[PDB]
Design a protein around this nucleic acid. Structure first.
Ligand SMILES: Nc1ccn([C@H]2C[C@H](O)[C@@H](COP(=O)(O)OP(=O)(O)[C@H](F)P(=O)(O)O)O2)c(=O)n1
Ligand SMILES: Nc1ccn([C@H]2C[C@H](O)[C@@H](COP(=O)(O)O)O2)c(=O)n1
Ligand SMILES: [Cl-]
Ligand SMILES: [Mg+2]
Ligand SMILES: [Mg+2]
Ligand code: NA
Ligand code: NA
Ligand code: NA
Length: 326
DNA sequence: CCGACGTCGCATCAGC
DNA sequence: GCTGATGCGA
DNA sequence: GTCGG
């Protein structure tokens, strides 16, 4: 990328503000600025040039001037030397360990991978699985493997009930050549915004995927969201594939377009689009787009018959999934 | 200046 | 048990 | 940290 040094610096700062400072709005601000700089089609020559972009303000412009001049950021060089910040940033790389638990572990003297493995009984279920697969979960998934995973999920879903439709979303649907995990949107005509005519709709699919040894572990599970672990089958004498994170979201079938807009992302794209919706007097979630009254109270859901209908309400030209990788 | 910043599912805990 | 935060996650 | 009223 043209501005990878700057965007990496802002990402590291975002991660510091999220994991150490526990400042979620600074995290979002740094990530928004990193994203707008990442798609800027010029090699940035000054902080003033970057400050013209939405989400880049005075302070990031100053950091960009320091980084352009020296190749580094003193603020980050200090953060790296802080042992508490270093430890907290490492611990939060385990799935299920967030900013609060990381700081509590550091207080308790649990600061390393060796420390975590010594103290499994101090971990909740999610954290225990996150530790088990710590290395695997930092590996990316080649699109070729995503296609094999898609084949399994779609065919196994069809064996349970031919009326299910499973849609792989996330970076995969945005056409990425690799993905961090697999995101599966699921619908069934028995589950709509008006009624649930069949119990265990998500459970039956999870169960079938466990039965064929595709799903290997569960991080959390409810009526509409599964968060877990999966693994492709390997052939004779082959090294095993890495275990992969999988998310399955069962969405009311009549609300598929809002659901697939949400689950396609990216996360920053969704934040930007929902923020624009609010400025336009609407609120968007994974189910509906609703107007806002003068009181700021959301009104009744608006008719939606395509993803583009949602863009139209907020006066955005349509963006294909491949152009949503913010 | 300063209030707002996207929205919500599941796990966990506190208070009753 | 229920209800309402809070944490961590999508 | 940045934006917008
Ligand atoms: N904070 C978030 C996180 C996710 N999401 C939505 C949008 C994401 O695209 C979708 C899947 O979450 P994810 O973390 O797997 O993001 P992806 O877009 O798939 C990433 F590119 P990756 O390929 O690394 O998983 O959930 C969101 O709305 N808000
Ligand atoms: N998981 C899915 C995917 C699509 N669909 C529906 C939405 C549309 O009515 C129809 C067209 O699908 P597509 O948008 O993939 O062309 O399929 C669904 O009900 N559940
Ligand atoms: Cl809704
Ligand atoms: Mg994903
Ligand atoms: Mg605003
Ligand atoms: Na700007
Ligand atoms: Na984590
Ligand atoms: Na995911």
């Amino acid at each position: 990328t043209l501005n990878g040094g700057i965007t990496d610096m802002l990402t590291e700062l975002a991660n510091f503000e999220k994991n150490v400072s526990q400042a979620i709005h600074k995290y979002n601000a740094y990530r928004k600025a990193a994203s707008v700089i990442a798609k800027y089609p010029h090699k940035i020559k000054s902080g003033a040039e970057a400050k013209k972009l939405p989400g880049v303000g005075t302070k990031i412009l100053e950091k960009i001037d320091e980084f352009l001049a020296t190749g580094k950021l003193r603020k980050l060089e200090k953060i790296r030397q802080d042992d508490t910040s270093s430890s907290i940033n490492f611990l939060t790389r385990v799935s299920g360990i967030g900013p609060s638990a990381a700081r509590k572990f550091v207080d308790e003297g649990i600061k390393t991978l060796e420390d975590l493995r010594k103290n499994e009984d101090k971990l909740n279920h999610h954290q225990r699985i996150g530790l088990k697969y710590f290395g695997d979960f930092e590996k990316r998934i080649p699109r070729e493997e995503m296609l094999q995973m898609q084949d399994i999920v779609l065919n196994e879903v069809k064996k349970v009930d031919s009326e299910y439709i499973a849609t792989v979303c996330g970076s995969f649907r945005r056409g990425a050549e690799s993905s961090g995990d697999m995101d599966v949107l699921l619908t069934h005509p028995s589950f709509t915004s008006e009624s649930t005519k069949q119990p265990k709709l998500l459970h039956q699919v999870v169960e079938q995927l466990q039965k064929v040894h595709f799903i290997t572990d569960t991080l959390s599970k409810g009526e509409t969201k599964f968060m877990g672990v999966c693994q492709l089958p390997s052939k004779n004498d082959e090294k095993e594939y890495p275990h992969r994170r999988i998310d399955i979201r069962l969405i009311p079938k009549d609300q598929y377009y809002c659901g697939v807009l949400y689950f396609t992302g990216s996360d920053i794209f969704n934040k930007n689009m929902r923020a624009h919706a609010l400025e336009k007097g609407f609120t968007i979630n994974e189910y509906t787009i609703r107007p806002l009254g003068v009181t700021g109270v959301a009104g009744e859901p608006l008719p939606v018959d395509s993803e583009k209908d949602i863009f139209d309400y907020i006066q955005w030209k349509y963006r294909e999934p491949k152009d949503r990788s913010e």
